[PDB]
A paper describes a structure:
HP0935 is a small (161 amino acids long) single GNAT domain-containing protein belonging to type IV protein acetyltransferases. A biochemical study showed that HP0935, the only known protein acetyltransferase in H. pylori, can acetylate free lysine amino acid and lysine residues in proteins. The crystal structure of HP0935 revealed a conserved GNAT fold, characteristic of the GNAT superfamily. The structure of HP0935 is composed of seven β-strands and four α-helices arranged in a topology—β1· α1· α2· β2· β3· β4· α3· β5· α4· β6· β7.
To gain structural insights, the crystal structures of HP0935 in its apo and ACO-bound forms were determined to be 2.00 Å and 2.40 Å resolution, respectively (see Experimental procedures). ACO is bound in a tunnel formed by the α1-α2 loop, β4, β4-α3 loop, α3, β5, β5-α4 loop, and α4. While the ACO is bound in a bent (L-shaped) conformation, the pyrophospha forms hydrogen bonds with residute moiety is accommodated by the P-loop, and the pantotheine moietyes on the β4 side of the wedge-shaped cleft (residues F81 and I83), mimicking the hydrogen bonding pattern of a parallel β-sheet structure. The adenine moiety of ACO is stabilized by hydrogen bonding with side chains of residues S89 and N125. The carbonyl oxygen of ACO’s acetyl group forms a hydrogen bond with the backbone amide (NH) of the β-bulge residue F81, which may stabilize the tetrahedral intermediate during the acetylation reaction. The apo- and ACO-bound HP0935 crystallized in distinct space groups, C2 and P61, respectively. In contrast, these regions were well-ordered in the ACO-HP0935 structure, with a significant conformational change in the α1-α2 loop. In contrast, in ACO-HP0935, the loop shifts toward ACO, adopting a proximal conformation. Despite a low overall Cα RMSD between the two structures (1.95 Å), the α1-α2 loop displayed high residue-wise RMSD values, with residues N25 and F29 shifting towards ACO, by 6.00 Å and 9.44 Å, respectively. This transition constricts the ACO-binding cleft, likely stabilizing ACO and facilitating acetyl transfer. In contrast, in the proximal conformation, the loop is fully ordered and stabilized by interactions with the β6-β7 hairpin and symmetry-related molecules.
Residue numbers in the entry: 0 to 161
Amino acid sequence: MVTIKVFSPKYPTELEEFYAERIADNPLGFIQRLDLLPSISGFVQKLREHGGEFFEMREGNKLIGICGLNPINQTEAELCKFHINSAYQSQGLGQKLYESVEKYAFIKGYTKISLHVSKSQIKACNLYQKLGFVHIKEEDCVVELGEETLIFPTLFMEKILS
Ligand SMILES: CC(=O)SCCNC(=O)CCNC(=O)[C@H](O)C(C)(C)COP(=O)(O)OP(=O)(O)OC[C@H]1O[C@@H](n2cnc3c(N)ncnc32)[C@H](O)[C@@H]1OP(=O)(O)O
């Protein structure tokens, strides 16, 4: 039995452990040195302090999915931290999790959802196309992190809700 609600940790480091595993499972598309960035729990707090929200998906009490919503302005919000556990992918759960976040954004008053994603993330790019997102631009995003300089081929997308 699968449930979606606002995220609440079952134990203190649950989000950190789930996130690190999702990030390590996607080596081509994400910054891997999570120790050099603020914790995912601080990210959630930043979202909520600016009017955003962070959501969970659980099978029983087992976390299997996460998704964030970050406001840009009065009418535009950004999807972020969209992840489903490997064993539960490709069954329709991610689409259902997205549809919950979109409905929540629509009720809050957002009329546009934007996002960016690495081109290596094939499943996500197919889903966003299925959901009706439209490409804005492609770009090789340069990120300097510590003693490294990383290059991510990235897609930017928008969807109008109303
Ligand atoms: C804004 C951001 O956060 S960008 C970061 C996005 N996150 C990632 O890339 C992390 C890695 N991927 C994932 O965690 C997940 O696959 C998600 C969250 C992107 C998608 O959730 P899933 O459970 O896999 O998706 P779901 O089962 O609902 O599939 C929906 C659509 O995704 C696409 N898709 C899913 N699985 C596959 C697959 N194996 N091959 C190709 N396309 C696929 C299809 O378009 C599918 O629609 P369909 O079933 O009608 O053909």
